[PDB]
Structure formats: C-alpha cells, structure tokens
Ligand binder design. Sequence first.
Ligand SMILES: [Mg+2]
Ligand SMILES: [Mg+2]
Ligand SMILES: [Mg+2]
Ligand SMILES: [Mg+2]
Ligand SMILES: [Mg+2]
Ligand SMILES: [Mg+2]
Ligand SMILES: [Mg+2]
Ligand SMILES: [Mg+2]
Ligand SMILES: [Mg+2]
Ligand SMILES: [Mg+2]
Ligand SMILES: [Mg+2]
Ligand SMILES: [Mg+2]
Ligand SMILES: [Mg+2]
Ligand SMILES: [Mg+2]
Ligand SMILES: [Mg+2]
Ligand SMILES: [Mg+2]
Ligand SMILES: [Mg+2]
Ligand SMILES: [Mg+2]
Ligand SMILES: [Mg+2]
Ligand SMILES: [Zn+2]
Lengths: 98, 60, 24, 127, 155, 80, 206, 125
Amino acid sequence: KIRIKLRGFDHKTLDASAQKIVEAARRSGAQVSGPIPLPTRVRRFTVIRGPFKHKDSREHFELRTHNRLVDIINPNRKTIEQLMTLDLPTGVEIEIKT
Amino acid sequence: ARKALIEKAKRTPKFKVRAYTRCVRCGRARSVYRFFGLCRICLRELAHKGQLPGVRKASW
Amino acid sequence: GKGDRRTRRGKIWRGTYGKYRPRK
Amino acid sequence: EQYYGTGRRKEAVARVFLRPGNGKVTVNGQDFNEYFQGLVRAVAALEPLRAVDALGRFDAYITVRGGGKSGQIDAIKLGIARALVQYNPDYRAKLKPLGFLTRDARVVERKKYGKHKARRAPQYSKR
Amino acid sequence: ARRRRAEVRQLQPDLVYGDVLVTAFINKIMRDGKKNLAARIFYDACKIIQEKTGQEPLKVFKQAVENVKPRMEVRSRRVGGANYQVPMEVSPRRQQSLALRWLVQAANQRPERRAAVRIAHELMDAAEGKGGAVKKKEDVERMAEANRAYAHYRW
Amino acid sequence: PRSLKKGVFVDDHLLEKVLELNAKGEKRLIKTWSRRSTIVPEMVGHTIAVYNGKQHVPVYITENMVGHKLGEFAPTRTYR
Amino acid sequence: GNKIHPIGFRLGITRDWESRWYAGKKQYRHLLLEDQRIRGLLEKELYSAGLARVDIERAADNVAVTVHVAKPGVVIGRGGERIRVLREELAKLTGKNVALNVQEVQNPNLSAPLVAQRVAEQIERRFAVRRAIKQAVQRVMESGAKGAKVIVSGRIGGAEQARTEWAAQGRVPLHTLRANIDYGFALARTTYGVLGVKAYIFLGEV
Amino acid sequence: ARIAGVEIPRNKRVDVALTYIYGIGKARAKEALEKTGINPATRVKDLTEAEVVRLREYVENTWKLEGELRAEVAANIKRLMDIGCYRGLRHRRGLPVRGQRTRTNARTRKGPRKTVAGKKKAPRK
RNA sequence: CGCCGUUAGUUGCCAGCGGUUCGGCCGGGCACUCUAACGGGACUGCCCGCGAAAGCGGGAGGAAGGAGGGGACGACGUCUGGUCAGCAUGGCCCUUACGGCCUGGGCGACACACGUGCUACAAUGCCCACUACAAAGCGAUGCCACCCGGCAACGGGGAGCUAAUCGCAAAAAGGUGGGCCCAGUUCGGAUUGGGGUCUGCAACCCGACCCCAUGAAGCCGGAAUCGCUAGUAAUCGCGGAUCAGCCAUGCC
Ligand SMILES: [Mg+2]
Ligand SMILES: [Mg+2]
Ligand SMILES: [Mg+2]
Ligand SMILES: [Mg+2]
Ligand SMILES: [Mg+2]
Ligand SMILES: [Mg+2]
Ligand SMILES: [Mg+2]
Ligand SMILES: [Mg+2]
Ligand SMILES: [Mg+2]
Ligand SMILES: [Mg+2]
Ligand SMILES: [Mg+2]
Ligand SMILES: [Mg+2]
Ligand SMILES: [Mg+2]
Ligand SMILES: [Mg+2]
Ligand SMILES: [Mg+2]
Ligand SMILES: [Mg+2]
Ligand SMILES: [Mg+2]
Ligand SMILES: [Mg+2]
Ligand SMILES: [Mg+2]
Ligand SMILES: [Zn+2]
C-alpha cells in the first residue's frame, strides 16, 4: 500500500504525469485509487504598484501549489520497476511513503 | 542603498537582533517579502519577467 | 465596551485572554 | 425510499431528504426548532411544503454544512423545493412562479484595494 | 436615476401576518442589519397592541399608517430668484415611506424604556389620532396651504 | 509597572568598575555611556556621570532612587 | 502610469515562465537567488551571441540551463573550448552541476528582445534614431509577423529635453490575451544619459 | 452604612455599592463579599447589622483605602518628583508620564486647549 | 462567483444494512457534501407587440435573460505631474570627510492647528453564564492539543502535525438564562499610582501584554463636510503580509 503525494506549481503538468504514474493498468493489476484531487494552497503577495508613494495603487500576485494523491494498493515488483527512469515533467515533485 | 551598508553581509551580527533583511537584488531594506528575499519593487519586476516560477497575476 | 481591557468584548478586540476572557 | 434535493445559498449547503411521514423535520442530528431556536425567519424554510400542501405529509432528514443559520434557512428552502420536484415533476406549476426553484446567487462582494471594504471608499478632504 | 426610472424592490411578505407593509415597518425598525430583533420587536409590540386593546394588531398598524400618510408636503425650489417652498402632491409610494419612517422616529422619541412598548404606544396613539408621528404630518401639510401662493410651480 | 523578572539587569562594565571602587574610596565622577543599567544598592554614594547623546551629567546618587534605571536622571531633550 | 508588462499579463496563457521549477518555502528563496546569478553571468558574457532568453529548469539537484542565442557560433568557440569554459564557470556559482544547452534563433527579426537589443546598440553608435526605428520595424514586418511596434525613450540625439519616438505597423493588440506578443526591452547607455528601447512583436492568434 | 472611612454606599446591590469607596472596585467587591459570605445581590438597606460588621472588619483592616491611600499615591508621586527622575519632570510639567505622544492628543493630561496665533504670512489656515 | 455532467475516494454519511467504549469511532460503500481538473450551459435562440434595420417593451422555458454578479485589463495624449532615498543613469560636487566604524541620543520632542482613524456618549444597550452556525488563510529551529502551577499574562511538562489527516481556533454578533433600571450609571476606559509576565545584550528616553487601585472628557457634536444604488451601505467577528518583540485602531 504505497503513498504518493504529488505537487507542483502547474496543474496541466500534474494531471498529465499523475496519469503517467497510473500506468500499472487502468484496473487489472493493482487496484489504483484514481488521481486524487486534494485542495491547492494559495500564497498571495500584494505589492504597491510604483516605487515611492501612491498608496492606493496595488497589484496582486499569487503562487498556487496543486496537490494530488493517487495511491496504489498491493505493489507487485514490476509495478515498482516502472517507477524508475519514466518521467518528463520538470516542475512536478514526488513524495513517496508506504 | 549605500554599498557600505551591506554589513548585512556581517555573518556574525554580534547580537541576533541586529540581523535584518535587504533585497538580495537591489538592497532595499523595507518590503522584503521573506519568501522571495526580494523587496516589493523587485518582486513585481521579476514577476512580470516570468522569472518567479509559478507566480502569476492574481484575480478573484 | 471594546476599549475596556477587563471585559469579554474588550479582551476579544485586543487579541488576548486572561481573567476577564478565560482561554478555556 | 426517500426524496432528495441539494439547495445552496451564499456559502451554505443544505442536503434535503424527504421521507413520507408526520411532518417531523430534523436538521443536523437535531430537531428543526431546536436548531433554529428563536430565529423568526425559520418558518420560511418550509414554505415549499406549505404551498404544495405537504407541511405534515413528509418527514425530513436534512444535513446542513457551512455559512450562517439564516442562509442555511434559505438553502434548506431550495433543498426542499427541489426534492419535492423530483418526487413529482408536475409540482413545478404551483412552485416555479413562487420562485422557490431559483437559487439565490447573491454572494458577498470581494474587498477592493484602496477601498475600505469593496465599495466603502476612504474619506477625503479639500475639494 | 439619470437613465432608467428605477423600480421598487419587492419585500417578501411577513412571516406572521403575511403582509408587505409589516416587512417594510420591520425593516425601518431594524438597525445595523439586526433583522432578527427588529421582528422580535414588532411582534412583541403586537402582543401589547392586544393586551391593551380589543383590536387585532394588523388592522391597527394599517389603521395608523393611514393617519400618518401626508397628502401634501413642500420641497424647496431654486428659481430665477432663490428658494421657493413649492407645495407638491405626495405620490402613494412616498406616503408609504414617509409614514413608516415617521412612525419609527416618533416611537423612538418616546420615554417608555422597552422598544416594543414605544412602537406599541406610537402605533396605538397614531391610530387614535394623536401622537408625535401625526404631529410631524399635520405639521408637514400645514406648510403646504401656507405657501399656497407658490402652488403655480407644480413641476 | 515595568520589567525585571527572574533576571534583573545592570550593564556590567560599569558594575565591575563601581564594586572595584568599593575596596576603598569613591571616585569623584565615572564616565558612562550606558544609561541602560539599573542602579544597585552598591552605587549609593559615588556620583556617576550618565551620558546624554551630548553630555555626561553629574548624577549624584541617593538611596531614595535605587530600583531606578540610570537614564531616568539624564534628560535627553531640551525644552523651553 | 498605464500599461502592464505585456509578458507578465499573458504569463498565464500565451507565454510560459523563463525558469520553471518547483520549491518549498525554505528553498524557493535560495534557488531563485542562484538562478539570478546565472542570468547575470550569462547576459554579460553572451552579449555577442545576442541572447534572447535563458530557460532554467531544476530537479534531482541538477540544473538544465537552455540558452537561446541568434549565433550559437560564439557560444561554442574552438569547436567546444567555450561551451566548456562556460559550463565550467557556472559550476562554481552553482555547486549543483549544470547542463548548458544552446538554442538556435531562426529569425532574430521575430524575437522582440533581440530587435530592441539591435536598436539599443545603434543608438550608442550614434545612428539616426527615427530611421533606426522605422527600419527596425520593417525588418520585423518583412520577416512575416502579423504586426510590430518599437519605442525609444528620451534624449533622442543628445537633445536636452527628453522625448519619445515611435513607429509601428500591422496589428499590435495589447489588451487581447489570445495574442502572443513577444516583448523586449533594451537599455542604451549613451554619453549623455540612458535611453529605453521597448519592442513589441505580434504574431498568431489562438 | 459606614463601611470605610467616611464612606456610605446605600440602596444599590452590595457589590456595586462597595465600589463607592476609594480603594475599591468590581474586583475587591466580588472578593470581599465572597470572603465574608454576604450575598452580593442584596440591596444595601437589607444588610444585617451583623453582616455590615463582618464586611467592614475585612475591608478596613485588609486594604489601604480612602484617605490613607489618596496621600499614599500623592506622596508616592512626590517621591519620583524629589529624585532627579524623568517621570518626575513629566509629573511637574503636567505631561503624559507613561511615554505618549504630545504633538497632538495629550488633552487629558494638559487641560483644555491654550490656542495661540499660528501665522504671519501664509493662506487662511 | 451562480446551475448541471464526466474523471477522481486515508475529506465527506441516521444516504442503506452490521457493531458501538452512542465519537463516521469500527467494518464498510462514494451515492451526497466537498475537493479540483476537464466539459455542458446563454444565442435576443423561442413566442406576442412597436421597428426600414439595428434594437426596444413584454412573455415562456431555465440555476441564471439581454453586459447574470465581481475581478484582471486603461487609447493618441495631458500634467515639463511623482520619484536621481528602491534600482539604474548624463552632468556637477566631496575625497585624514559630504566616505567608514562604533557607543549614546534623535526620527517618539510640545503653547498650538489640520487630515485619516479608533473607542464612545448607552435599554434596538452593557455585564456574566450556557449554547449554535463561517470563509479565507498560516504553521519546523514553527503551530502548540493535553496535563500541572499561577487571579492572569505566562512558566514547567508534553501529544500530534513536513498538515483536506495536527494545531492556530474562540468565530462574533445570534439564540436561552440571569443581573443592571435613566444614573455620567454595572454607560465611556482616557489618565495616574502600584505589582507582575514575555521578547530581546538591552525596554529611562521609547515595547506589547496581565493583575489591583484610579475611573478623565464624553448625554450624539457650529460653520462646513465624506461614503454608499444590493449581499451595497450599516454592523459583527476571522486571517495574512512586515515581524524577536511591537506602539495594527493601519493595510491587503
Ligand atoms: Mg487603478
Ligand atoms: Mg547606490
Ligand atoms: Mg529587526
Ligand atoms: Mg464597561
Ligand atoms: Mg463584509
Ligand atoms: Mg574591561
Ligand atoms: Mg456537481
Ligand atoms: Mg446499527
Ligand atoms: Mg429582431
Ligand atoms: Mg519634488
Ligand atoms: Mg515618523
Ligand atoms: Mg495637515
Ligand atoms: Mg489553573
Ligand atoms: Mg436579558
Ligand atoms: Mg449621531
Ligand atoms: Mg453606481
Ligand atoms: Mg463602527
Ligand atoms: Mg507580528
Ligand atoms: Mg486585523
Ligand atoms: Zn529590491
């Protein structure tokens, strides 16, 4: 029962590589618990627009971290062998527990 | 600011309460968002140049 | 109300707790 | 076995379950009146059943999550009105013109910068 | 209203008299968004309208509103001179608002301590012909037919 | 309503100096720049010169003013 | 006042981030700083190649710098003895083992950063500004492009009173997101002040 | 009845009444009614003469109140006035002792406004 | 943001049965709520009337109907507008000081005046007790459950949480009960005397907080004057950034 919390700053690149982690099978080998949504955490920064005065200007920036879960039950060893050099996203990260 | 006044470089500040921030890009000592290490003015510049990964115009 | 330190309303307004707004 | 509608209102969600019964409504593991104790607006959550003659012909197990009790009232009201239409699609005639089917999309307006409060504008002098 | 004539909003009827006027009153009685204890007042006031009078409260509330509605009022006018107090008619929409507003205001002048009581007595006194609300109405109409000379600016 | 807990504070370079002059006689005037330091009972006697950002001052030191901080006796600003 | 960065505005869609990695709130600060140092050592030494942009990516400790230059000649050198020196000079500031790549720019007259960069250098070589700009635009319009626009700031010609010179043709539709408008800014350190060269280049739609 | 030196709080609840003495507020009232076991709620006139006594015998012998306090504080100030103290100066001038601003807003320490002429050659303000 | 669908089940449940140390705590399933990716949905498309047309008025169906609600987004130009103290940067200027380091002081000075605010002057109220419903956020040399000591700030001990799972966290107005009874009051919390806590090398100048006592002015404000057309104003609490701490009632 392996645990895989996925997270990055882009979500087009997440759901398209969490999908690539569910390449054991659609549902014929190990169970597969589907790519789990799991709420995103939004940091915000609010900057005064110009240098020097003009209090009332302001402009909003956000940086949002999206998080997935997946989780596979009953890990056959060839399912793990696929967790080797099989990736393409650069801005996606990978926590793994069991 | 004064190039001299980056004795923020002083790794030992004697007391940890003389430790302060400064923009790592411009020296600004006064809106240095600690996440980025950048001041408010540099942050908006870098945000707009797309050199702060993941950072985006935010509206809601 | 909100100005008096030794009250419910007043302690709520100023973040704090104490004799007049027990933490629990 | 029962009948169901959702109904949301201003950050609040009710889930309405309609049993056939005596008129006993229960809201969040509690009696209907024990939950809206002393809120005069309460009785208006059940204004669908009142205006399709159902006030006492249904029991109602309702779960309610989020917001504040007065919005929960409006949201239950939508919840009921919807269950009561998937139980008998003909009920719309004596239900739609009353408005009970519409969902109140009136929601808190965002806080704008340089304002105090979305629209409250800071006060100025000399002009 | 520079573009459209701007319509009136339709307050949902009372929960206890199923009436629109009673919501309106309750709304004028309410302050700071506390609608619960504005209704908690008007109704407490209604218990009092009976335990002091054989009459049903709705019939009395309605009765007193009518005694406060002003058939005439003045609103000032800038001319080719200055301020002329032109006696105008008063639309049925504006009589509504004026009556209700005047009723609450009058009520809150009173020396009775509970709010329901003040509303109660004002609501009663106004039905029976007297009371501060009516006085700032018999007054209002007195400024009309006194500036009657300026009726020929009817707008 | 101030603040000296289970610590109590007196800046020490001035302290080792006054206790030193309590082996014999009292040095007329001591040049301090630390107004930071509370007064101990062992200071009652020798006149200490508290600074000012501008001038050391002849602060004679009575026993009626022990628990107080030094700078409480050398006014900073000048007024009318 | 007016006019947001046409890049930072479109950053959502039609234009992606120069450096695209992920990092926690105890790392982001550091990676960002070093990321900058790289751009600095890069924008100074690679001037001759005329670098449009520098993509930087990170992962299992390693760093994939993907430099975009008009003339990859000047970044290679003795058949290598330059791309090695620079992948080396990066290994000192970045203790994390770098990987320098080089990207051809098919059409320097279709990358706003270079177009502007072009104009900048002329203004220092005392070219005629008005023409420079009308020309610069044409060179961009002749190379396909649905539209383009250039702007020189102030003190055109040593002129004591700072001005602004213009030029632009085709469509340059700033308020439409669905655009793709490469933007580029070049500085011009002249004898008598500084000048700013902004370059807009519209192309495509969806 | 006479609780503390020349004090006479009548006709309200006992706790509220006790505060009409100088050294006593809501907290010493509560306390000294708990520790003498008189129901705080009773009106003053309905206090047992025996009660009134166990009340006084606490309050008076346990706390510095009224007169013996008013000149403890007064003479407490003269202390910081008689040493070279800063708070003393502030007491002597009549200016916010606890480290406030005085550019504006120190009315409560300063008394009413002593308004003076402001300009000699500048607009209307 | 509002309605609906598909994908997705270490958050969600008298939906449906089993167990209960009556907590979705346990088996167990994802229907529902939600979470968040991708889609549908609106078009003056349909009907009636005016119109040459664009469109206008109205009416159905619909979660929503003519720009459904709110953001981001600001033209050629104007002001020789703001900013060389964020950053660049031409010129001019100083170069045992117009550079540099300290320690202390100042930026916090008070006879006065203005701006923006906060807290009020109370009964549609204030106090105490019990009890009910949020959203958005933040958390490692951090948030701190829980236990013990203290009236308390807080100290000692200690669990969990790299957090949809642990914590900040109590939401508050509201509701039920009790008290106050028209009073400068159980309104208002300014001032001042005392005793403490914590942060920091250090709180005199000049920190925040807790406790005791003190309990000012203020009974709704002249001339004038500001905001707001709907989840708006009004009102109530909550969070973050900055930051050891904090003068935040400011700001987002
Ligand atoms: Mg603006
Ligand atoms: Mg400099
Ligand atoms: Mg600091
Ligand atoms: Mg009070
Ligand atoms: Mg609000
Ligand atoms: Mg020494
Ligand atoms: Mg759905
Ligand atoms: Mg069972
Ligand atoms: Mg048509
Ligand atoms: Mg100027
Ligand atoms: Mg200042
Ligand atoms: Mg001014
Ligand atoms: Mg305890
Ligand atoms: Mg009560
Ligand atoms: Mg008023
Ligand atoms: Mg408007
Ligand atoms: Mg207010
Ligand atoms: Mg802070
Ligand atoms: Mg706040
Ligand atoms: Zn900066």
